[PDB]
Amino acid sequence: TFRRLWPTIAPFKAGLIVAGVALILNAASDTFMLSLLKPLLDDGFGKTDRSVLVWMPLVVIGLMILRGITSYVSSYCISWVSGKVVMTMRRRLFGHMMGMPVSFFDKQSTGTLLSRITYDSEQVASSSSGALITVVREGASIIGLFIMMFYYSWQLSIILIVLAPIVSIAIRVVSKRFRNISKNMQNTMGQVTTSAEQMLKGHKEVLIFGGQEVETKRFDKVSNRMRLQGMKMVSASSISDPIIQLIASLALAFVLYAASFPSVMDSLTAGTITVVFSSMIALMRPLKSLTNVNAQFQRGMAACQTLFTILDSEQEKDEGKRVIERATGDVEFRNVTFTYPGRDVPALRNINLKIPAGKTVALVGRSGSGKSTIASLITRFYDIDEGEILMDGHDLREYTLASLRNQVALVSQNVHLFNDTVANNIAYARTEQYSREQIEEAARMAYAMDFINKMDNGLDTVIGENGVLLSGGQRQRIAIARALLRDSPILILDEATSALDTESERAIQAALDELQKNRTSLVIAHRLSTIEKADEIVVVEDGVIVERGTHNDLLEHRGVYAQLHKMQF
Amino acid sequence: TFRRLWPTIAPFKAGLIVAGVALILNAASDTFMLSLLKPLLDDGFGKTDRSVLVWMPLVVIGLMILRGITSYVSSYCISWVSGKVVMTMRRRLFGHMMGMPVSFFDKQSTGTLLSRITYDSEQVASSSSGALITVVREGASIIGLFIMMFYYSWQLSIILIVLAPIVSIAIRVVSKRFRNISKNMQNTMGQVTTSAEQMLKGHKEVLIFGGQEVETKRFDKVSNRMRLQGMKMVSASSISDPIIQLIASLALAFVLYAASFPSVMDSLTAGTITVVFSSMIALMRPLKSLTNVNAQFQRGMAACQTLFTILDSEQEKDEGKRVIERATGDVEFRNVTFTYPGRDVPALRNINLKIPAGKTVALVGRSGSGKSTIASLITRFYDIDEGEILMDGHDLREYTLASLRNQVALVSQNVHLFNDTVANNIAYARTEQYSREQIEEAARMAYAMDFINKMDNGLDTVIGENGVLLSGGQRQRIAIARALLRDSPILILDEATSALDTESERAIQAALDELQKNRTSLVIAHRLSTIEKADEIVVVEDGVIVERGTHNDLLEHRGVYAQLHKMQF
């Protein structure tokens, strides 16, 4: 289409302008080179003993140096422009992405999203740059070649432009007719191939009926028909080439017949003919390329449109306007039915689960569904499909998103550690608020001080990718230390690390005890020790509150907790 | 370089010869055509007279007509050998394919077999033809242009052909160095892309901690480094072009200096330089084609090796010495444990089932495992992995295969209706053995006479694919007529349809009665009526002899016949 984007290009108008001149001169750096033929072939050889011939190599060297300089400067400046445009574009896109809700990150577009960030964006920038250079350099080449043509031949140029389009249309029509014939006969080829296919698949019958000889005979006939069809097809193509070659040669012969001696022509001869011919042969390239530019510009902006489909999709709406420094009130699900976006089946029915302050609630459903989403619900990553989760007398959707997300600290077994220094990761975007000594104290009370200790730079080492590549349990420890630093009232534990880590599983247990010593302690506790530690275990088989109460009572009445308990054994 | 084809390409050598001769001119045409340039640009346009100018178009037209006719004739004739080799290889493949055991049709090759027959054999022939047409045309052009050059310039030919290869090596070395730089820098840029991928992948933890600001900042940094890497990459890729262009232009400048500085040169005049330059400009292509010639040769001839592997493999083993007209004595597989080739699990376990003369036995199974292959065992489609199949006290493995195939007739809902006429299908490959009248008599006694009756040409109607396209039940009716005309003693019937076609199922039951009125009948049966009809229903669930006896007796002993009757209802 006609896009927009003129802002986000406006400041770098200077760099583009350089190409606008540089590329233009590039055309001259070729056109004059072509023009250099006329001084040579007319007056720079055996006709003259020695003259223009001795200096011409210097002229060619200088012209090619000019071409190289123009190419380099044009490439650098068109780069600069494209790089700046893509710079601003990627920064805006990623800024909107980070605010974009998890609904967009429904795992449907995870792979495509990095593509949009880098590959598709670079593709659009490069396509637009290619379009600009192909409409500037090649466009100016056309104009220069025509100007030189007229400056050299007064009448012959009109002959060439009168004859070239007629020749092109004749070649196109003959090629179209012969390609249509070729495909029409390719259909017969396919029919005979199907005959052979039906020949083969009957082997089961052929062998049992002992008719291999008649099969051989009819295959002889069918193969002969195949050979005849291939004959005719190859003949069609082999006559297609000579006809176009002949029409081109007839065009050239007509041109050379215009070299007759009326007053119209033949006063410009010798090298002039050579330069016009070479100019036309070279013009063959710009003319062919320019018509292709339409298929390029769209090929770029279409992607932009596609990219725009990703830029302004459903966005995160912080409709809530209530801010709380701390959430001392108990967490209470109330008649909350959750529908997972992109999934018709409701992952949760209405539930009135209440999480008292400073109490441990364990959601330990073995169903493997709904339980994970329950952890997200308190954080409002998704949206409450139905019902209300009330917080100190106020619904979650009523609260400001930033404050609520602050109220909750998330720790799991797949904590995606950020590529930064270890100290910063302890308080991301808040390390300015927290003192370094506070980070060290949190790490020590996090029962994970050793990992920083034996690390060479301690609280100054880059830790993420291209860092140290610590184990999953180490990520658990760093995340729990981060939580201790944040001291958020709301706590969610995945506990997914059901495996027993060597020398750290006990450390992890002690650290989780420190984490849950106070503050709300909703946990997804698969481990039996965490289950018994929980004050009010509320296990859900992804539908409803199937069982609830203390673990011993849950064992008393079988329900579903009995099977889960015996599975844990 | 195997060239086992040469015995199979000798009978057409003559045509190939006229391909080469006609191809040599297809090169010489250009050599003379470019030579025509010298008259044009030396004693042509410039001079007042048109002596060589008016005929110029006539010579071009005549010479290009010669070029076109040579191209057409040479390509058509090389395609003649190509076709008559591709077709003979195809025919040989098919001939040794019909004799191949069903093992080759293990479904290891179902559609790749058709690909071999047409696509791969074509590739063989077309690649060999291209090798010839590009090591004759192209080499002929090479030698022609070289001799033309050396004729026109005593020394310039050397001073140019000695620059061509040094220039080529310089271009290649600089290109390789810049490509290595480009790939290394692209690796760095990809590393930065992985950093950005980590950046975006952490959206969950980015949002929960309310730190999108620091995320945006570090994204600014990483993306700025991205843009620097992209700028450097584009700079390197672009500056690659000027260096090669400049080295080429420097070589050309040296070439021109070769005429300029010395006095031994400078007799070249004007046209001769254009002749030589165009000679090399064209020759740049034939050298590339010749370099690729051997690549194409060994790209295509390996297809011939594969084709020979298809050809040169064990034809269906015919290690049988016993011929019998009719096997009235009971065929029985005793202590036979069959293994489906390519399937480790035996589908048959040492079953000692005897098929009594005249009396009908039935094999019945839900999954069909083993049961389906029980019938196949009788025809020796597969081979005797264990045990012996003794018909009239004589082993099938001992019997000549053709006689055994005659002994047993296969009838099923799915039958390959040969792509021929109705009568020939009724007696495939033995229509000579069975006279025409008995064909329609057997159709009438088959109770499926109507279809032959109402057919367009009746008994002579083409019935194959790309033809009438009867239904599956109709094909089964044609098969029943097939077997009835054959009157074979052994009858294996799939009964896979187990469905009532309108007006055709009762007819099929009657035809089954007629076929099984006498003759041994091993029937894979699902119909309850067929089950009760069989004297001994030895139903096997792939275990072995799972259960046997009359349907009433099978009911008495529930075994598997209880669930079998459940399925029947």
Curated annotation (Swiss-Prot), chains A, B:
Q: What is the effect of changing H526A?
A: Lacks cell viability and does not support growth. Can still bind ATP and slowly hydrolyze ATP, but becomes locked into a closed dimer conformation
Q: What would be the name of the gene that encodes this protein?
A: msbA
One of the GO biological process terms: lipid transport
> Which positions are annotated as binding ATP?
G365, R366, S367, G368, S369, G370, K371, S372
Q: What is the lineage of its organism?
A: Bacteria, Pseudomonadati, Pseudomonadota, Gammaproteobacteria, Enterobacterales
Q: Which GO terms describe its cellular component?
A: ATP-binding cassette (ABC) transporter complex; membrane; MsbA transporter complex; plasma membrane
Q: What is the effect of changing C304S?
A: Does not affect ATPase activity
What reactions does this protein catalyze?
ATP + H2O + lipid A-core oligosaccharideSide 1 = ADP + phosphate + lipid A-core oligosaccharideSide 2
SMART domains reported for this sequence: AAA
The family database entries (Pfam families) matched by this protein are listed as: ABC_membrane (PF00664), ABC_tran (PF00005)
What else is on record for this protein? In addition to ATP hydrolysis, may utilize another major energy currency in the cell by coupling substrate transport to a transmembrane electrochemical proton gradient. In vitro, MsbA-mediated ethidium efflux is dependent on both the electrochemical proton gradient and ATP hydrolysis. Identified as a drug target. Inhibited by a series of quinoline compounds that kill E.coli through inhibition of ATPase and transport activity of MsbA.
Q: Which InterPro entries match?
A: AAA+_ATPase (IPR003593), ABC1_TM_dom (IPR011527), ABC1_TM_sf (IPR036640), ABC_transporter-like_ATP-bd (IPR003439), ABC_transporter-like_CS (IPR017871), ABC_transpr_lipidA (IPR011917), P-loop_NTPase (IPR027417), Type_1_exporter (IPR039421)
Protein family according to the UniProt entry:
Belongs to the ABC transporter superfamily. Lipid exporter (TC 3.A.1.106) family.
Q: How does it sit in the membrane?
A: Multi-pass membrane protein
One example of the protein's molecular function in GO is: ATP hydrolysis activity
Q: Where are the transmembrane segments?
A: 52-72, 129-151, 156-175, 242-262, 264-284
Q: What is this protein called?
A: ATP-dependent lipid A-core flippase
Please state what class of enzyme this protein is.
translocase
Q: What Gene3D superfamilies has UniProt attached to this entry?
A: ABC transporter type 1, transmembrane domain, P-loop containing nucleotide triphosphate hydrolases
